[PDB]
C-alpha cells in the first residue's frame with residue numbers, strides 16, 4: 001500500500017457482465033479498513049437489493065440484509081446496515097476496473113490487489129458522516 005496512488009478519481013468501475021458504469025473511484029469509501037462501499041444517492045439508482053439467506057447475518061457492527069445486484073442481474077455485493085445507515089458493499093471481483101488516460105481494463109480478486117488508496121471511515125465516524133455530508 002505504501003506505493004499506491006491516493007487518487008481514486010483515476011479509476012471507474014464497470015459491471016463485469018453488462019459493462020454499465022457502476023461508479024467512479026471517487027465515490028468509494030473503505031469502512032473500518034475493510035468494507036468498500038459506495039454511499040452516494042446516485043449509486044442507489046443503479047442496483048437492486050434481493051434476498052439471499054446464504055449471505056444475510058447479524059454481526060456486531062452491522063447486519064447484512066440482502067445482496068446488491070446490477071440491473072442486468074449480475075451480483076455486485078451485499079447490503080450492510082450500521083445503526084440504520086445503508087452501506088452498499090462492493091466486492092471487486094464483480095467489476096472491471098478502468099484506469100484513465102491509458103484506458104486499460106483490469107480485474108482483481110481482492111480490493112488490496114488494486115493499487116489505489118481510498119478514504120476511510122471507521123464505524124464510529126458513520127453517524128457523523130451521514131448527518132453532515
Ligand SMILES: [Zn+2]
Pocket residue numbers: 015016017018019020070071072073074
Ligand atoms: Zn450489469
